[PDB]
Symmetry: D2
Subunit: 432 residues, 4 copies
Amino acid sequence: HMQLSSLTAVSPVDGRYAGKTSSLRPIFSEYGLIRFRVMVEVRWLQRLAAHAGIPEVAPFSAEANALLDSLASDFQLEHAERIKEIERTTNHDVKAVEYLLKEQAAKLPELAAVSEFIHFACTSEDINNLSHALMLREGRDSVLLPLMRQIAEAIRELAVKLADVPMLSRTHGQPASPTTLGKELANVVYRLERQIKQVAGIELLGKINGAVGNYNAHLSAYPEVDWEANARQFIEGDLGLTFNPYTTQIEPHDYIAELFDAIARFNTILIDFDRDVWGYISLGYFKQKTPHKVNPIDFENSEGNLGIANALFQHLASKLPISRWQRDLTDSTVLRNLGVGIAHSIIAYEASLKGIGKLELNAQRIAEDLDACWEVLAEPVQTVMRRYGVISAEALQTFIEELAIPAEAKVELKKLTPAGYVGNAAAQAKRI
Amino acid sequence: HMQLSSLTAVSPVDGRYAGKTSSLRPIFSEYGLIRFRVMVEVRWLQRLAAHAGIPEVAPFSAEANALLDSLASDFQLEHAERIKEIERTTNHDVKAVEYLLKEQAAKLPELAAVSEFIHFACTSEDINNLSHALMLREGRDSVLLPLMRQIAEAIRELAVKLADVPMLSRTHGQPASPTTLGKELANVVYRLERQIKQVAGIELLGKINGAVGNYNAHLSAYPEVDWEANARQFIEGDLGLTFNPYTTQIEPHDYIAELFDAIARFNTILIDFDRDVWGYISLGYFKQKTPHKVNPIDFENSEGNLGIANALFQHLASKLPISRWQRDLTDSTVLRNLGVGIAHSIIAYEASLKGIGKLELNAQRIAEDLDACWEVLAEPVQTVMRRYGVISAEALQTFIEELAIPAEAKVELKKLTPAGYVGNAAAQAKRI
Amino acid sequence: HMQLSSLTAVSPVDGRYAGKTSSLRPIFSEYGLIRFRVMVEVRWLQRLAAHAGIPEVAPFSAEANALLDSLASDFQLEHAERIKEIERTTNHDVKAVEYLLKEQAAKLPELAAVSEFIHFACTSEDINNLSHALMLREGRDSVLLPLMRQIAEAIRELAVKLADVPMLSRTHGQPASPTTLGKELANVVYRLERQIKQVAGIELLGKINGAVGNYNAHLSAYPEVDWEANARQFIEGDLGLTFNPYTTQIEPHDYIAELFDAIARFNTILIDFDRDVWGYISLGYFKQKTPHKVNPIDFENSEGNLGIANALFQHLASKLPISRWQRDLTDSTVLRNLGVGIAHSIIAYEASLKGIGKLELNAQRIAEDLDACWEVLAEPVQTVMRRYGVISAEALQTFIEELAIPAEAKVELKKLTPAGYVGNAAAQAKRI
Amino acid sequence: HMQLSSLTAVSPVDGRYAGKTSSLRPIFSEYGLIRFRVMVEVRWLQRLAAHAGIPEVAPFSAEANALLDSLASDFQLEHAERIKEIERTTNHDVKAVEYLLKEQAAKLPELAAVSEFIHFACTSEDINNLSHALMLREGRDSVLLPLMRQIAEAIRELAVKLADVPMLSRTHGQPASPTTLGKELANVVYRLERQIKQVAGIELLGKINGAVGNYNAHLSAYPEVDWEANARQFIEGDLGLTFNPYTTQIEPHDYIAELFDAIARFNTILIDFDRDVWGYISLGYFKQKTPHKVNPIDFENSEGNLGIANALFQHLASKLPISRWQRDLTDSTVLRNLGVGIAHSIIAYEASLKGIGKLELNAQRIAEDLDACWEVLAEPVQTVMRRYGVISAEALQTFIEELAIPAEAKVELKKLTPAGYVGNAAAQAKRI
């Protein structure tokens, strides 16, 4: 038997790439799950204390709220370790959270007096689903989106820098009408930013409604309380999530599919970018900074990890929203992997950022391919001939002068070179 | 060699289920692709005719517009057959569309005079991408969304009808706090309608910008025309699509991934429904209308086709937005399958609708399971005991009377039966 | 409503590519399913006639066997059309096959006398599973494997032809130790032929054992007959398939997953080849026969169709072998698509063959890249230095002469050029 | 920042399920990769020492082989830690292995004398591909296959125990001809054992041929050595793997797809079993040992993990065998996940074994459903009537006596009960 460390970890998420994924440890690990379960339970008790229709839980003093707030906003590793020890006796992970809170409540008579209202009328999935939404919110807002925007801005900076650099296009791998290198990078920024907006806009849904979605227990004890209004206030007001009014025992997980589908679309664009840049490197269009070749390993590591991320995202999106009758428990183990596709994504984003920072233009190779391709000028000549109802630089001057076009058109056509035939690529690139 | 018919078709889309998919023949077949290519080319010529900066194409008479409008809005099978014959000579499908329009333009001297402006400055993908967006728009709006809404409304009608029918819940397959059958159906309506809104809201993106995205040819012939403003007017104003300002030779297909991801999420909810209903049938909770068992074949046929649809949607979403450099042509053959996942979806939707229409409540079996499960009343008794700081119908009356709870609580608790312990399921179901 | 033809077909299997998939119409269409159902039923009746333990069915005369053999080995479209008409009354597809055979048996008093033994003791899935295995056998052996072997042999011919052509290798897109173009093609042949052997070796499993796998009905009527021995004789001896002794109502479909996984592996190698050849074309290493560029469209069409084929193969392999309890009917509709992944595969194989036939070496471009890369000779110099314990052609001659290596080694090292540094690539390529 | 432990690990492979996956730490972690790289390098040096055509490396003394054998067969964590420290200076993981071996060789003048032949003529992928094959071999043979066989034998034991227990079948969820519970379990054993044989039979392929597959460096230094024969001897003879004679820089990874496809097929059968058992539990056919319901959580945890395993297996099988030209490096990061699908598989296998061990027959519920379904006897009555050319127990006795069948048939038919109508299910189950 070998002790666990990054050297011995089976998955490279916590192994080879442990340093790239460490920002997810407070969020998606069992520690993070425990952290958010504690937060939800604490806030639920505070909600009952604030609710005048639940007189059995009175408003808390500053002293009692200080203790509760410390558990919900300054959670310590020792609390999670204690919950793991408690779970040895409860054989149930959410019940262990309840008992930790009961142990903490025993420190103050004011909290001990209402210890039986911890988890009041709740089912385990009331705590779990809100925890998952809060985990996804923190992962999305504090880790994933910042890296996504860093990629977009890094590519934008290069697109503007290279906006005026003419470059031969390749369609089906072969010469095509010219563009600029900055324009080809700007195209990627625009696609990535569409998906960033979609990722940021996904509603993160939560519920709190008891065993099967119908507030049965709540209404047996407190028939006069509007539990649906309380649930919406708790979820939207206290927790800052979006309310899901119709559920079974579980929140149905459609929004997780929505979020993972959006991240996967961002990742697909980044795969396309990683492969195109690998190709530009193979052509010698980029070189090493400070010609020394640039090794494309960072783009390749990114590409490999994005494919794994997307395979996990696709599976979770396809499988999570199917649950037998009022639920089966297959989702419990699967939801322990909410951070794994995110981990492979952020490994890839860091790698793509590292690769982008190594890129320096090799203008000589770019110009070499463009000047060797005067065939790209057949298209503008044909289009000008077509307007007026009608290869080498030397041949172009004699051909154009013999055309039945206005002399002003011949003057501009005769000045045409492959590097000049870029349309409005540069203006489009500059304003990305 | 065997002649093609629905009996000999290799794919069941045009074979066994030809009658279920016939509404897609005007849209996603090669006929539909040709139809929309013709429409785009006609509208492009009309756009140039309306554009004062393109004086070489003057506004058309009513007579000339009548001919053009007939091709763009009353397209005939004979025109598509002629395009297929022309393609034998052009060896190029978009070029065959151009030649058909040139043949039609030859009928009127006014149109013949501008025949060289058909396809002016366009690349094949300018026509193809707009065609694909228009195909997806018609398929989504006229075929897919109506069926999706029919499913939601059919389930809503049953949910309201059955809103008051108490039913034992099953979590991990085993008895749980009761609900109503109508509530369990209402949950599905709510999920489906979220995805319907997402499907309807996807932007269908188009571009028209020449060979590589930079208007190179347009600007060589007409340097003074604002071609980007013209493209947005054509796409948003004339065609009613959403403009994509940054592309390569192809429109990058991210929006197709967005649309297919949304349809797939709807389909996942419907798989979940098909399987749950199969389970309710297995329990005998539904019977045949007009007890005669109901055969669940329609739900099973739906479930099978939804899985195929989603596999195709996932592949197209994952693969289409990756294209080498300024494009490779792998997307051309793949985009001929835009209607195939939609076809399997609508086969499944029709089957689910047929199955829903066969369902009739078997109240005896539902009540039998509920009355045989007094264990579900432990939860409300525990919760009431918990509020006040504290199985059979006969045992419940003696147990409750011995509790230290207010007599008003004992009166309500003693009246508890499994069929009565439904929380607010009925009110939630009725307002779906 | 539009009449069905290849122009109006929704799926390109029977649409744009109808001419490429027509060889599957006798096999995987509803016609093919019907054809094989008839074959199985006829052979089953003949098996009972030959079985001395079933005296109620006596051996058939030559006249009666002539009629039966015509249905089982010279099946006509009119019989399938009649079965479709009969199905309008039976509302059951296998029952319609039974009634067609009863109608044919009515033509001869000898067959009419035993018409009630058509389908004797069978369940629908006894007929269906054997039909599916026979469909897969004919599709694999008569269509798929011949095309797979054609690809392997076409690449082999080019590998041997080009075995001596030195070529710069590219690892991570950048120059690496040289190989020969023929060697790089030979590598593909070897991989493809491994998968061909695996495809050909899959056992195609069948069963015939009544409603749930236990011969219940057979044993009630004929308790003294060894029905398991009869089933193995029918399946292995009469039909030439492999016997599956343990099933439920359905044959469990694991072997279909085995077969589809093997075809998918062949297809993955072919995708890799299609993309590598697209790359060699982009480098100008191949040109058009009879330099004129070769358009790589055939490789791109192949690549696109292989991805679709593999997505369908993966879904059917993953979903078919899961069936609720003694079976659910979701497999029935899915198995109508057995030929669809095969269809996309053979579309791709034909396209790859067409592309291979267009390839002609462009020796000038290949030699140009090799001579411009003397850096590849650092590896052999280092290795020779390492053996004995120790860039340009002019610099290499002076560097080698100063080394403390045997003079015989310096003579061979000084003769080193990039095009000569190919190891044993040519000998490996020639013997593929 | 949080220190890594099982509590803080992002992936549940090394987190919640660390205790279930610990047997993979010596194999698939970075430690395991390093361990096998060291083994391959040591054995390669020993191969050169044994090769008379490489006189520069003489046979090793017992003392020198003792040191080398200790590194290759008694590898210590401290060696892997040292390699990680060395990698800080080399910036290259395989080069760090080379330097560790050079440091160890410095301990003995005999080994120091040939330190420059460590890694002689090798490329990094020569070491990596053999390491991967050896990792897969140990994972398959020492961890995966033993658990797979444990599942098969555990189900076999229950199948034989329950071989005589009659049970109503359910097809499309509804009553069907009876079977025995042991027969339904035996069906699973047979399917699982077919896949076990396939998993065990996959060839694990290796190569050792330098930078691009052509032995370029080897032949420059030792033109007279048969390096292909040496490679086959090393791989098949010294390492016990299967030789792959045609590769590029990488071994192409087809065999990894073969292995992962086979494991995935086993896993699909186990998903089917997990779901069927969940269903039998929901029906009350199994209860808790020592009626107390059995909670199906172990089957649900298994089912969830099998789906994740298969998604990873499918992705690696589909992506690994595609590598640009003579290779791209996307496979390097992906191959760090070789153990992750295996980890989710063994988590699921342990869970399924735990669930199987909790199952105890509830004969009362099984008999209750069977006796309430006399409709299953229509099939045997119809079949007997059909042989001779022709519901309740009381109605069956009067109906059978009125039939024109031999009196011996009526005596056996009149004795028919649903629980007796099991065909040969029991004999098939007993011999599994």
